[PDB]
Write a structure and sequence with these properties.
This is part of a larger assembly, with chains A (581 residues), B (340 residues) and C (154 residues).
Chain A (H helix, E strand, L loop, with lengths): L3 E8 L2 E7 L7 E7 L7 E8 L15 H7 L4 E6 L6 E6 L7 H9 L11 H19 L12 H4 L6 H8 L13 H13 L3 E7 L10 E6 L17 E9 L10 E7 L4 E5 H6 L8 H8 L2 E6 L7 E2 L1 E2 L6 E6 L6 E2 L12 H16 L3 E6 L3 E3 L3 E10 L5 E12 L5 E14 L5 E8 L12 E10 L5 E11 L3 E4 L3 E3 L4 E8 L10 E5 L8 E4 L8 E8 L5 E10 L6 E10 L4
Parallel strand pairs in A: 8-12, 14-24, 18-24, 26-32
Antiparallel strand pairs in A: 1-2, 3-4, 5-6, 7-9, 7-15, 9-10, 10-11, 12-13, 15-16, 17-19, 19-22, 20-21, 20-23, 23-24, 25-27, 27-30, 28-29, 28-31, 31-32
Chain B lengths: L3 H6 L3 H10 L13 H7 L4 H7 L15 H8 L2 H9 L14 H8 L2 H9 L14 H7 L3 H10 L13 H8 L2 H10 L13 H7 L4 H9 L13 H8 L2 H9 L14 H5 L5 H9 L14 H6 L5 H8 L14 H7 L1
Chain C lengths: L5 E2 L23 E8 L5 E8 L5 E2 L16 H12 L12 H14 L8 H7 L10 H4 L2 E3 L8
Antiparallel strand pairs in C: 2-3, 2-5, 3-4
Classes of the chains: A alpha+beta (581), B mainly alpha (340), C alpha+beta (154).
Amino acid sequence: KWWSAVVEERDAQSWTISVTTPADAVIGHYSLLLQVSGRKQLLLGQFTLLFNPWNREDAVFLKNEAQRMEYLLNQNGLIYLGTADCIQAESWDFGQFEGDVIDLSLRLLSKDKQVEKWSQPVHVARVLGALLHFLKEQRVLPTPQTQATQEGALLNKRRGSVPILRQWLTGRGRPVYDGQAWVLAAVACTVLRCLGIPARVVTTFASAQGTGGRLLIDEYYNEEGLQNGEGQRGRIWIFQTSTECWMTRPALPQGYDGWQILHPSAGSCDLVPVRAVKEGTLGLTPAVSDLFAAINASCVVWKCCEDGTLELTDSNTKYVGNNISTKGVGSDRCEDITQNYKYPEGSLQEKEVLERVEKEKMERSPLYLLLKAPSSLPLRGDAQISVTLVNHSEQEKAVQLAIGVQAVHYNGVLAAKLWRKKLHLTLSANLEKIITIGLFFSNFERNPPENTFLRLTAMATHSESNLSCFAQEDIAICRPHLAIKMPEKAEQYQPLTASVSLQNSLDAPMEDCVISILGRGLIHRERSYRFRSVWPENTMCAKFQFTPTHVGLQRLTVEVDCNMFQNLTNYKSVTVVAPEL
Amino acid sequence: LPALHIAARNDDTRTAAVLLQNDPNPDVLSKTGFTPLHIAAHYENLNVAQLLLNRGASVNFTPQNGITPLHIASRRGNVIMVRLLLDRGAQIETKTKDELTPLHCAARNGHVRISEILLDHGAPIQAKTKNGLSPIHMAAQGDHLDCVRLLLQYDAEIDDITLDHLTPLHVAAHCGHHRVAKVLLDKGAKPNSRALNGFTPLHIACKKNHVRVMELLLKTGASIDAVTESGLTPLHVASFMGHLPIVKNLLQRGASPNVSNVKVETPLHMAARAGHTEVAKYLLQNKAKVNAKAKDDQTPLHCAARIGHTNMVKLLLENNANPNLATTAGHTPLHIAARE
Amino acid sequence: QMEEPAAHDTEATATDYHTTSHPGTHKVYVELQELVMDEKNQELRWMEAARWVQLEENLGENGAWGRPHLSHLTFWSLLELRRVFTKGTVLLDLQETSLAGVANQLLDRFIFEDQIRPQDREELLRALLLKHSHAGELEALGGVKPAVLTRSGD
């Protein structure tokens, strides 16, 4: 159990000494010294000691093997973006097993000066979360307000996690703008996979990041159907990334081992077990209440007017914290672990927990509409939407209907006003009425930014009564598909031919078509190729040749840039086997 | 031998090595009856698994339970154990006491990769346990989404039934999972499919108070009007169970409180059998004729009198149902009020 | 025909590959080898010619090393070295463990910058993978002579 060494095998000029380690020891750069009774103590070398989820008696221990191989030994991950209605994967490279990651991580850790509390993963995780959130608040620059499309090909391309770590510690590379501030979780996961703590990166769509401790969110909307002014203390983001780490909690009461969410606060961080979020125990850790408020809280909507008087409006209820997803194990598909965060809505158990948490917090329409909109909208294209209206009154009524479309960043920040339309209708005889209207991109007023999502709002004002009905939907923008053709198995030290196909679905000819291939263990760094003009009717088809070198499971990525769009990424996996003897 | 399994639990290689060097017994039963290979499959210790499989460890060695070691390895989810046990030889198509296939236990826990490997190795996708549930039905129970996608992609007959005719939409609406409901809707399903009771999935959603499933089903186009084999409507089920927001949504989206069952009963009659007050106010707010006759021409005051509930009456008296009204037998609300 | 694209160099993404780890200081030992062919069988092979531990020490035809001495060059050597290094190909921080992978990546990088024609890749990959003898085998070989490669490989 304690530090030990046995001399197992003996030769006249050699000894084979087997050093053994205790289960609870401080990690870091060690040094071995040999001291005979006579001579001065002699330096023998250096090594490093890390955590092992393979040992049974250590705290951070994983029983299943494939979970270990996916969560600890893997390097080629996925991060899910987009709206909850259509989820788009993006290939990401953690690269935790590079050369410099371990020494950089230990140098970041060593600014704590509390040495003996490094034997435990809780203290290390909390400290590293706090430091990485502080560094993100330090080195992230706001977006340039001026429009630079010619440099938009360089502002928003990401290569992995390690260049961002280097640029955050030393500041000798490209900065990361506010358009992509969600990298932080992945970075933290990188550090934990370096140190021995299993971790993964989850995405919560429609999360309530903002102020916490209150189960209600206010939103203000214009008479025309937009949002007057900018910002709010608590708003509903389109998505939000977070980090989960697997460990055991000895300091807590018994029954909380497993997954924990790492939560930094605006600096002291802390981590909370997921079962605490499901059961709802607020008083176990000061951070549980805000995280539980972050998942299931409801919003109310206010109507601003010309007089300045705010009005409540009756709208359809929207859900918060749905479609929790992450990378599946041993494959390249998504899996939802959302059953670990909430009960099914409308059960006795979830009603019980809601009533209990509300009791604990207590101590501290004649017409309506509804909207059908598609989940995805093509670039340089069009779609159809429909609004129905049902009245319940024997008398006829006049109504004014407004429709607004506008792009929004991923953190609720307004970007540009795009479209609005106002019309008058007369409903009669208590009959429903459906209005179908097209939406063409050519009818828009401005070009959308690089990473935005459109918010479509509809507001029906009754002419007689000032109480009005409201609905909103979110739509992500879809880009043309990028076909990769490549065989499943390849032989080592052999040529391999990949094919890439692209169809110009867009109405504009592409110019300055520049594509690039890269991949870890397949091609050395990065390759670039140029092309001719691609007309809107025709397609493009290209072919590349390389040769795999490292046996096992790899994947390659392709990336396309042009004048219409930038950073269109895709990936494909391959299994390479050792050659036959 | 009560310690051979302890050596299996701790993966003690040398101790078991001596124990099989001396003793010739490769498999003994505990008081439960599980072999050392069964307990080796649990804690995933595979060096001893190799040692056992080198000699006599029958992969198809079933006790009276019939639980193969492959069943437990697929249960807890160990991948390399599945590959090892299948490489040394395994009969996939076996039965437990409850006739559970390895695919059944794989689908219930949610391990998607074991299901991929097993269906690659020729396990029959379509199957029927003692009841007759397919693996897709059981995986649809435990809210395993990507397993549903995988079973659909390789091979699946979607509109499968069992002894109680249950589409996977039925179990999805009975267990409250809208996520698999989306996939089953857009890939292929029929909302019109009815169970042995004659129930739509909308009826089950009205019973068990799931709302998002109801919204997805009605956005698909499951009909509002529907007749159970008893004679009920989803409005009647929602009224009898006491769920207010389901009533609100169903009455907003277009419904008629004036509907008759095989015994002529409004949802006011169907409500005053239990006395949910707010649903009664909400149904009365819209156009429903409180002056009504039941099968024996009992007024809703007659059905309300057996409850003994006080303030439910005054809301009914707000729409002035007369106490002059009496049933066919001549009984009046005073008569039943004195009877009860 | 499937039209193959042309190359294009852009250093916008180079700074994402600059490591920060200090390599340190290390002494060097240089070994030079060149293509030859032995007399008993017409087989090309790489043979060492000199070493640079402290001074240049050359290997004679008899197989015995001579005296160390200072290193003097010729002007054409330095001129052609500057010319060919001005348009040379560099590969920094390659992640390899065997010579075949280094050869394959170097050949692919050669093809990328249009140094050689694609139909010559097979011949160079066959050339760079022959066996590398040492000083002990020379007297077993009976002598070696310069051997320039040919397209047919003879």
